[PDB]
Amino acid sequence: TQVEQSPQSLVVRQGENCVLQCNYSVTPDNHLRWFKQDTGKGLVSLTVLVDQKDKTSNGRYSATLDKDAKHSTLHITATLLDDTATYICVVGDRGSALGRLHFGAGTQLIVIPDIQNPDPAVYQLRDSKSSDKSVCLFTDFDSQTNVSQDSDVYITDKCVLDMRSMDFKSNSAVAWSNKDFACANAFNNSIIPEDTFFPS
Amino acid sequence: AAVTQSPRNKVAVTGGKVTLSCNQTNNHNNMYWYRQDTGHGLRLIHYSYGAGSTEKGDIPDGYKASRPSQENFSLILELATPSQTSVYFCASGDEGYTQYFGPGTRLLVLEDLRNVTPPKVSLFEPSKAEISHTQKATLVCLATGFYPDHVELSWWVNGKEVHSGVCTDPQPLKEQPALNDSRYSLSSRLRVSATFWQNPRNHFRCQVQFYGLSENDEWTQDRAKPVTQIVSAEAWGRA
Amino acid sequence: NYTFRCLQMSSFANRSWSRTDSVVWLGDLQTHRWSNDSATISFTKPWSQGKLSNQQWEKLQHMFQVYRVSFTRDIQELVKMMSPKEDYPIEIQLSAGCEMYPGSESFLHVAFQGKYVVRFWGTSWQTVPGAPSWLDLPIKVLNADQGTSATVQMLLNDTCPLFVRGLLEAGKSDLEKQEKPVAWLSSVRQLVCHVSGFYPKPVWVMWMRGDQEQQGTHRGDFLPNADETWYLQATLDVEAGEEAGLACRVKHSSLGGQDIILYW
Amino acid sequence: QKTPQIQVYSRHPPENGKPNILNCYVTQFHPPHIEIQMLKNGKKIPKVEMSDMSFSKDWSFYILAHTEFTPTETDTYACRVKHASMAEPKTVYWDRDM
Ligand SMILES: CCCCCCCC(=O)N[C@@H](CO[C@H]1O[C@H](CO)[C@H](O)[C@H](O)[C@H]1O)[C@H](O)[C@H](O)CCCC(=O)NCCCCCCCCc1ccccc1
Ligand SMILES: *[C@@H]1O[C@H](CO[C@@H]2O[C@@H](C)[C@@H](O)[C@@H](O)[C@@H]2O)[C@@H](O[C@@H]2O[C@H](CO)[C@@H](O)[C@H](O)[C@H]2NC(C)=O)[C@H](O)[C@H]1NC(C)=O
Ligand SMILES: *[C@@H]1O[C@H](CO)[C@@H](O[C@@H]2O[C@H](CO)[C@@H](O)[C@H](O)[C@H]2NC(C)=O)[C@H](O)[C@H]1NC(C)=O
Ligand SMILES: CCCCCCCCCCCCCCCC(=O)O
Ligand SMILES: *[C@@H]1O[C@H](CO)[C@@H](O)[C@H](O)[C@H]1NC(C)=O
Ligand code: NA
């Protein structure tokens, strides 16, 4: 490993800045590129630094390169939820196709979203075909609430959605079981808010 | 400068033949194949400087490469093993240093195919209470009983894919966490405005693209051949 | 009026074996060597660092250190790119440096299998007249890089002449040394006047009859001695019994008027 | 591919019994891989020094072999050169004169 990235992973709250480091021993070092890779998806180039002492910017992303120290930093300003991704540092050893690319193993960023107007609730939802089957949706809780996983009952991790046009974010988790199972009892094993709306 | 890969996702059996293809219409002389495994950066397998030429990269063992034309560069796994489970990325470029990457290909090599099973998909309609408490309507889609975990869940409203207001569990959960080849479940939410759900001309579809067997994989069991396929569930709005 | 040559030669036998060796000349005196076996460039004179500070020298050597490793991989890699057009064995020669006049011109010439095919000129690599056209792809790749081009321009335009100006000043007394030729005679008729030990290279050797220059005198090539002095022989065809009254006369700047005359 | 020229010659004027230096100058050959031996009476002389290989304006290589010797009436001295351009080793004897 001639390319090392630090930290391995970090968790930051929406709107905070963060800094990612890349250190390398690759020789020579023609240029250094930073990639953003979303979960599952592909490699999106953020910037490429080419000079001995270099600085670049691309919106909220800014970066430095010092070739004497063999050191680069990627700065992210005012993190959004969409910055949740792995950030990869790549050093090219030629300014041509004769070059090899030397990849870092990446830094995992998670951005915790800001939930403005929480309204924690647990609703029951029925199958469009077979109305005797159902799920329990726990939604609208703030980001300081953990969901916990009876092996015949299933509960999913929390997950945040973004209704872009309305500028609105909400967490949710889902629970279901055929085996006696009702939505009042589904999230018993979780520390949930006191004002949680259980309807009916 | 665009590069495509196919297939995008593949379940294979040990000892089988797998061919990953990369297409590129930029008239680039140079193409490159990598694999990405957690805790490692992309590693170079094979590359090519043009039609008829293939070169060993850093980790060529288990792989043959083939460059039949300027446009196509292929990665051939003659006798696939579980250790070749990975995400594979193809790239191309001209005489400059930039390599343009494809979107990647996920390969899972199983020891054996006996447990491969497509999902059942159900769509659960929004709660009356949620609507009246929030002026918002959350649909939930549930995929169940599938193996292995190579699925792509997507949401479609009137025949067009929607991403806004969606979130899907980042990984499937195991239905029987004790058992070794446990089948998986996966859930997703789509949240819309109450007025949009109340429009009975809006058609909502949860779709699951399942990756399993191909046409030419052997199948010796009674049940239907668990082929690569789509399973979906559907509902209309109501006033 | 001195020419400074950095002469590099590289043999690539097959995909995994190669070597690169160089030597550096100022006029006809060797200033440096860099064997494939050394990590470092070796001075062959006390004044070979010129007027460069130790820090300027280390910086320069370090760039050459990266160059040698990089050059080696580039050639291997270009061979793959051109397969099966060209293949091993491959010989590559570079001849590089600057020619100094009072008040300079730089060059970098490349040979492939012993033929001059490529030079650096202006801001880029180019093929020269007679070069096969397949070399356009390598050249386009080299010209892509920009960082190498800037560094080469700087080496050719600035580093070379500045460095050689210092070398000439530091090596003054060696470059201007005067060493005397010693001569001797023999035969096989073909008479041979041997002349050895002289520096610098300009010298005049004729056979004589008294004061009459024997135009039959065939002057040989200049051959080197190990001590960086020169050897030359002048031969003459004659009849047997005609060798009386013949002399070999030698003129050289180290003798200062008093020429050498050996009578047979 | 070109055939190497070989010129054998002495540093100082040769006098029997007097220590001297014998030079073998090999030129105008390509490719550069070459094997040079300096022989005394056909046997290989042990401590033969060599200059660094270099090349001329015309891109052909050259190299100077040299060694300490004391010439005598009885002893012969030679330079043997093996090169890919020749099927067999070319040998040039020191001619007593040079
Ligand atoms: C006396 C000259 C000294 C030059 C020093 C230059 C700086 C230097 O080290 N560059 C190297 C490192 O570059 C990297 O690092 C530096 C940072 O240090 C920069 O970031 C740079 O952007 C980056 O890319 C680079 O790799 C270079 O290409 C080495 C070879 C250069 C050379 O000798 N060219 C002439 C040979 C022409 C052969 C013609 C084909 C016929 C043979 C053939 C063809 C096909 C088939 C067979 C045979
Ligand atoms: C360096 O000098 C060159 C021109 O000098 C010639 O080429 C050198 C490499 C060397 O071989 C010399 O002896 C030659 O006299 C400059 O090239 C010119 O650059 C401009 C653009 O920058 C271009 O318009 C001209 O056409 C170029 N000249 C030629 C002859 O092609 C070069 O820019 C100099 N670079 C630096 C960094 O000083
Ligand atoms: C010429 O020098 C190079 C570099 O010093 C040698 O290449 C090294 O060879 C060793 C031993 O085989 C390898 O382990 C190294 O990986 C090589 N080093 C580099 C930097 O590539 C080369 O062997 C030498 N050639 C000859 C003929 O001696
Ligand atoms: C190469 C032309 C410019 C040279 C200007 C710096 C000369 C410094 C002399 C010592 C360098 C010897 C290295 C020779 C380089 C080579 O390997 O070709
Ligand atoms: C490469 O060349 C060297 C020197 O000519 C030789 O000894 C070696 O065996 C060669 N290797 C091959 C052909 O694999
Ligand atoms: Na290279």
PDB file of N, CA and C in Angstrom, chain A residues 2-4 22-33 48-54 64-72 89-96 98-103, chain B residues 97, chain C residues 62-63 65-67 69-70 73-74 145-148 151, unseen atoms left out:
ATOM      1  N   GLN A   2       0.929   1.918  -1.165  1.00  0.00           N
ATOM      2  CA  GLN A   2       1.620   3.194  -1.326  1.00  0.00           C
ATOM      3  C   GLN A   2       0.689   4.403  -1.204  1.00  0.00           C
ATOM      4  N   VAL A   3      -0.597   4.194  -0.959  1.00  0.00           N
ATOM      5  CA  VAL A   3      -1.508   5.322  -0.765  1.00  0.00           C
ATOM      6  C   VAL A   3      -2.352   5.089   0.490  1.00  0.00           C
ATOM      7  N   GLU A   4      -2.243   5.984   1.477  1.00  0.00           N
ATOM      8  CA  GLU A   4      -2.922   5.821   2.771  1.00  0.00           C
ATOM      9  C   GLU A   4      -3.852   6.989   3.044  1.00  0.00           C
ATOM     10  N   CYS A  22      -4.888  12.324   2.681  1.00  0.00           N
ATOM     11  CA  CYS A  22      -4.270  11.311   1.833  1.00  0.00           C
ATOM     12  C   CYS A  22      -2.763  11.479   1.883  1.00  0.00           C
ATOM     13  N   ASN A  23      -2.070  10.403   2.238  1.00  0.00           N
ATOM     14  CA  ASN A  23      -0.614  10.383   2.271  1.00  0.00           C
ATOM     15  C   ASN A  23      -0.151   9.261   1.399  1.00  0.00           C
ATOM     16  N   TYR A  24       0.926   9.505   0.651  1.00  0.00           N
ATOM     17  CA  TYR A  24       1.419   8.521  -0.282  1.00  0.00           C
ATOM     18  C   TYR A  24       2.938   8.472  -0.356  1.00  0.00           C
ATOM     19  N   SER A  25       3.441   7.319  -0.798  1.00  0.00           N
ATOM     20  CA  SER A  25       4.859   7.136  -1.118  1.00  0.00           C
ATOM     21  C   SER A  25       5.108   6.894  -2.626  1.00  0.00           C
ATOM     22  N   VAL A  26       4.056   6.932  -3.447  1.00  0.00           N
ATOM     23  CA  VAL A  26       4.167   6.734  -4.898  1.00  0.00           C
ATOM     24  C   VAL A  26       5.245   7.648  -5.479  1.00  0.00           C
ATOM     25  N   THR A  27       6.112   7.106  -6.351  1.00  0.00           N
ATOM     26  CA  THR A  27       7.162   7.870  -7.073  1.00  0.00           C
ATOM     27  C   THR A  27       7.253   7.498  -8.563  1.00  0.00           C
ATOM     28  N   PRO A  28       7.227   8.498  -9.481  1.00  0.00           N
ATOM     29  CA  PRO A  28       6.900   9.906  -9.248  1.00  0.00           C
ATOM     30  C   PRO A  28       5.412  10.094  -9.036  1.00  0.00           C
ATOM     31  N   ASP A  29       5.050  11.318  -8.696  1.00  0.00           N
ATOM     32  CA  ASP A  29       3.678  11.703  -8.405  1.00  0.00           C
ATOM     33  C   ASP A  29       3.300  12.855  -9.338  1.00  0.00           C
ATOM     34  N   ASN A  30       2.711  12.500 -10.480  1.00  0.00           N
ATOM     35  CA  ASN A  30       2.323  13.475 -11.493  1.00  0.00           C
ATOM     36  C   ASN A  30       1.088  14.236 -11.078  1.00  0.00           C
ATOM     37  N   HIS A  31       0.087  13.515 -10.586  1.00  0.00           N
ATOM     38  CA  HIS A  31      -1.159  14.135 -10.171  1.00  0.00           C
ATOM     39  C   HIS A  31      -1.911  13.284  -9.158  1.00  0.00           C
ATOM     40  N   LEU A  32      -2.859  13.928  -8.477  1.00  0.00           N
ATOM     41  CA  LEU A  32      -3.656  13.287  -7.440  1.00  0.00           C
ATOM     42  C   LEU A  32      -5.107  13.680  -7.622  1.00  0.00           C
ATOM     43  N   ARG A  33      -5.983  12.678  -7.647  1.00  0.00           N
ATOM     44  CA  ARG A  33      -7.394  12.859  -7.883  1.00  0.00           C
ATOM     45  C   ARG A  33      -8.198  12.351  -6.712  1.00  0.00           C
ATOM     46  N   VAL A  48      -8.764  17.262  -9.454  1.00  0.00           N
ATOM     47  CA  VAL A  48      -7.458  16.704  -9.769  1.00  0.00           C
ATOM     48  C   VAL A  48      -6.422  17.798  -9.539  1.00  0.00           C
ATOM     49  N   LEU A  49      -5.450  17.519  -8.680  1.00  0.00           N
ATOM     50  CA  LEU A  49      -4.390  18.473  -8.344  1.00  0.00           C
ATOM     51  C   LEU A  49      -3.135  18.041  -9.098  1.00  0.00           C
ATOM     52  N   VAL A  50      -2.442  18.995  -9.732  1.00  0.00           N
ATOM     53  CA  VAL A  50      -1.294  18.687 -10.604  1.00  0.00           C
ATOM     54  C   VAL A  50       0.052  19.353 -10.273  1.00  0.00           C
ATOM     55  N   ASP A  51       0.047  20.478  -9.558  1.00  0.00           N
ATOM     56  CA  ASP A  51       1.284  21.218  -9.251  1.00  0.00           C
ATOM     57  C   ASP A  51       1.931  20.811  -7.942  1.00  0.00           C
ATOM     58  N   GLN A  52       3.190  21.231  -7.813  1.00  0.00           N
ATOM     59  CA  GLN A  52       4.034  21.015  -6.641  1.00  0.00           C
ATOM     60  C   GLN A  52       3.333  21.433  -5.345  1.00  0.00           C
ATOM     61  N   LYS A  53       2.790  22.644  -5.350  1.00  0.00           N
ATOM     62  CA  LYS A  53       1.927  23.155  -4.279  1.00  0.00           C
ATOM     63  C   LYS A  53       0.673  23.566  -5.008  1.00  0.00           C
ATOM     64  N   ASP A  54      -0.427  22.858  -4.789  1.00  0.00           N
ATOM     65  CA  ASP A  54      -1.654  23.112  -5.540  1.00  0.00           C
ATOM     66  C   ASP A  54      -2.845  23.262  -4.603  1.00  0.00           C
ATOM     67  N   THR A  64      -6.077  20.513  -1.289  1.00  0.00           N
ATOM     68  CA  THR A  64      -4.682  20.916  -1.365  1.00  0.00           C
ATOM     69  C   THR A  64      -3.796  19.736  -1.758  1.00  0.00           C
ATOM     70  N   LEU A  65      -2.666  20.053  -2.383  1.00  0.00           N
ATOM     71  CA  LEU A  65      -1.616  19.082  -2.673  1.00  0.00           C
ATOM     72  C   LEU A  65      -0.282  19.729  -2.380  1.00  0.00           C
ATOM     73  N   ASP A  66       0.531  19.046  -1.574  1.00  0.00           N
ATOM     74  CA  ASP A  66       1.928  19.395  -1.373  1.00  0.00           C
ATOM     75  C   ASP A  66       2.735  18.169  -1.788  1.00  0.00           C
ATOM     76  N   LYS A  67       3.461  18.275  -2.901  1.00  0.00           N
ATOM     77  CA  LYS A  67       4.283  17.150  -3.419  1.00  0.00           C
ATOM     78  C   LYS A  67       5.552  16.845  -2.634  1.00  0.00           C
ATOM     79  N   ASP A  68       6.186  17.849  -2.039  1.00  0.00           N
ATOM     80  CA  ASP A  68       7.333  17.603  -1.155  1.00  0.00           C
ATOM     81  C   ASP A  68       6.963  16.704   0.020  1.00  0.00           C
ATOM     82  N   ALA A  69       5.858  17.021   0.695  1.00  0.00           N
ATOM     83  CA  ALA A  69       5.359  16.201   1.813  1.00  0.00           C
ATOM     84  C   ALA A  69       4.593  14.937   1.370  1.00  0.00           C
ATOM     85  N   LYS A  70       4.191  14.864   0.108  1.00  0.00           N
ATOM     86  CA  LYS A  70       3.407  13.739  -0.418  1.00  0.00           C
ATOM     87  C   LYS A  70       2.103  13.614   0.355  1.00  0.00           C
ATOM     88  N   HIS A  71       1.389  14.727   0.366  1.00  0.00           N
ATOM     89  CA  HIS A  71       0.245  14.928   1.211  1.00  0.00           C
ATOM     90  C   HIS A  71      -0.837  15.735   0.499  1.00  0.00           C
ATOM     91  N   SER A  72      -2.076  15.241   0.586  1.00  0.00           N
ATOM     92  CA  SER A  72      -3.262  15.954   0.120  1.00  0.00           C
ATOM     93  C   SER A  72      -4.388  15.926   1.175  1.00  0.00           C
ATOM     94  N   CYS A  89      -8.743   8.457  -2.815  1.00  0.00           N
ATOM     95  CA  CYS A  89      -7.580   9.219  -3.189  1.00  0.00           C
ATOM     96  C   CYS A  89      -6.798   8.387  -4.199  1.00  0.00           C
ATOM     97  N   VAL A  90      -6.419   8.982  -5.339  1.00  0.00           N
ATOM     98  CA  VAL A  90      -5.746   8.237  -6.417  1.00  0.00           C
ATOM     99  C   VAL A  90      -4.547   9.034  -6.913  1.00  0.00           C
ATOM    100  N   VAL A  91      -3.382   8.393  -6.948  1.00  0.00           N
ATOM    101  CA  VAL A  91      -2.153   9.031  -7.428  1.00  0.00           C
ATOM    102  C   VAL A  91      -1.714   8.378  -8.743  1.00  0.00           C
ATOM    103  N   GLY A  92      -1.531   9.217  -9.759  1.00  0.00           N
ATOM    104  CA  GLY A  92      -1.055   8.804 -11.068  1.00  0.00           C
ATOM    105  C   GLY A  92       0.417   9.125 -11.143  1.00  0.00           C
ATOM    106  N   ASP A  93       1.201   8.137 -11.575  1.00  0.00           N
ATOM    107  CA  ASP A  93       2.666   8.252 -11.636  1.00  0.00           C
ATOM    108  C   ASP A  93       3.244   8.718 -12.992  1.00  0.00           C
ATOM    109  N   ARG A  94       2.385   9.109 -13.940  1.00  0.00           N
ATOM    110  CA  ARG A  94       2.802   9.747 -15.194  1.00  0.00           C
ATOM    111  C   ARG A  94       1.733  10.706 -15.668  1.00  0.00           C
ATOM    112  N   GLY A  95       2.157  11.722 -16.415  1.00  0.00           N
ATOM    113  CA  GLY A  95       1.238  12.608 -17.105  1.00  0.00           C
ATOM    114  C   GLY A  95       0.801  12.098 -18.477  1.00  0.00           C
ATOM    115  N   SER A  96       0.749  10.774 -18.648  1.00  0.00           N
ATOM    116  CA  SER A  96       0.332  10.137 -19.882  1.00  0.00           C
ATOM    117  C   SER A  96      -0.279   8.755 -19.608  1.00  0.00           C
ATOM    118  N   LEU A  98       1.041   6.041 -20.194  1.00  0.00           N
ATOM    119  CA  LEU A  98       2.069   5.139 -19.681  1.00  0.00           C
ATOM    120  C   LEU A  98       1.992   4.992 -18.141  1.00  0.00           C
ATOM    121  N   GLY A  99       1.070   5.723 -17.505  1.00  0.00           N
ATOM    122  CA  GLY A  99       0.957   5.802 -16.080  1.00  0.00           C
ATOM    123  C   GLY A  99       0.141   4.683 -15.501  1.00  0.00           C
ATOM    124  N   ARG A 100       0.468   4.348 -14.260  1.00  0.00           N
ATOM    125  CA  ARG A 100      -0.361   3.504 -13.413  1.00  0.00           C
ATOM    126  C   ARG A 100      -1.017   4.392 -12.371  1.00  0.00           C
ATOM    127  N   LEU A 101      -2.249   4.024 -12.022  1.00  0.00           N
ATOM    128  CA  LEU A 101      -3.010   4.650 -10.962  1.00  0.00           C
ATOM    129  C   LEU A 101      -2.870   3.853  -9.686  1.00  0.00           C
ATOM    130  N   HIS A 102      -2.651   4.555  -8.582  1.00  0.00           N
ATOM    131  CA  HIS A 102      -2.420   3.934  -7.295  1.00  0.00           C
ATOM    132  C   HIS A 102      -3.549   4.404  -6.397  1.00  0.00           C
ATOM    133  N   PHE A 103      -4.432   3.481  -6.030  1.00  0.00           N
ATOM    134  CA  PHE A 103      -5.679   3.820  -5.337  1.00  0.00           C
ATOM    135  C   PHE A 103      -5.524   3.678  -3.839  1.00  0.00           C
TER     136      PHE A 103
ATOM    137  N   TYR B  97      -3.452  10.997 -19.314  1.00  0.00           N
ATOM    138  CA  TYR B  97      -3.455  10.223 -18.061  1.00  0.00           C
ATOM    139  C   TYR B  97      -4.847   9.913 -17.477  1.00  0.00           C
TER     140      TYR B  97
ATOM    141  N   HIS C  62      18.724  13.530  -7.917  1.00  0.00           N
ATOM    142  CA  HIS C  62      17.457  12.892  -7.542  1.00  0.00           C
ATOM    143  C   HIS C  62      16.494  12.842  -8.734  1.00  0.00           C
ATOM    144  N   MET C  63      16.476  13.892  -9.544  1.00  0.00           N
ATOM    145  CA  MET C  63      15.653  13.907 -10.743  1.00  0.00           C
ATOM    146  C   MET C  63      16.140  12.837 -11.733  1.00  0.00           C
ATOM    147  N   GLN C  65      17.740  10.111 -10.845  1.00  0.00           N
ATOM    148  CA  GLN C  65      17.368   8.842 -10.224  1.00  0.00           C
ATOM    149  C   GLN C  65      15.947   8.443 -10.567  1.00  0.00           C
ATOM    150  N   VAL C  66      15.022   9.391 -10.524  1.00  0.00           N
ATOM    151  CA  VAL C  66      13.624   9.111 -10.865  1.00  0.00           C
ATOM    152  C   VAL C  66      13.505   8.865 -12.369  1.00  0.00           C
ATOM    153  N   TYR C  67      14.255   9.623 -13.162  1.00  0.00           N
ATOM    154  CA  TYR C  67      14.301   9.453 -14.623  1.00  0.00           C
ATOM    155  C   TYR C  67      14.694   8.046 -15.067  1.00  0.00           C
ATOM    156  N   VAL C  69      14.644   5.034 -13.534  1.00  0.00           N
ATOM    157  CA  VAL C  69      13.583   4.067 -13.206  1.00  0.00           C
ATOM    158  C   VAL C  69      12.353   4.278 -14.097  1.00  0.00           C
ATOM    159  N   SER C  70      11.957   5.536 -14.289  1.00  0.00           N
ATOM    160  CA  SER C  70      10.781   5.878 -15.085  1.00  0.00           C
ATOM    161  C   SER C  70      10.985   5.592 -16.558  1.00  0.00           C
ATOM    162  N   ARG C  73      10.758   1.844 -17.332  1.00  0.00           N
ATOM    163  CA  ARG C  73       9.382   1.336 -17.381  1.00  0.00           C
ATOM    164  C   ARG C  73       8.631   1.844 -18.620  1.00  0.00           C
ATOM    165  N   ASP C  74       8.877   3.090 -19.008  1.00  0.00           N
ATOM    166  CA  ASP C  74       8.260   3.652 -20.214  1.00  0.00           C
ATOM    167  C   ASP C  74       8.604   2.873 -21.465  1.00  0.00           C
ATOM    168  CA  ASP C 145       3.321  14.374 -20.735  1.00  0.00           C
ATOM    169  C   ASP C 145       3.889  15.803 -20.556  1.00  0.00           C
ATOM    170  N   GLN C 146       3.018  16.708 -20.112  1.00  0.00           N
ATOM    171  CA  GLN C 146       3.321  18.132 -19.981  1.00  0.00           C
ATOM    172  C   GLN C 146       4.412  18.380 -18.956  1.00  0.00           C
ATOM    173  N   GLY C 147       4.366  17.668 -17.830  1.00  0.00           N
ATOM    174  CA  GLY C 147       5.387  17.801 -16.790  1.00  0.00           C
ATOM    175  C   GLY C 147       6.796  17.418 -17.249  1.00  0.00           C
ATOM    176  N   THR C 148       6.912  16.376 -18.067  1.00  0.00           N
ATOM    177  CA  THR C 148       8.211  16.005 -18.620  1.00  0.00           C
ATOM    178  C   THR C 148       8.709  17.069 -19.598  1.00  0.00           C
ATOM    179  N   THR C 151      10.111  20.133 -17.701  1.00  0.00           N
ATOM    180  CA  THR C 151      11.401  19.774 -17.111  1.00  0.00           C
ATOM    181  C   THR C 151      12.506  19.683 -18.171  1.00  0.00           C
TER     182      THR C 151
END
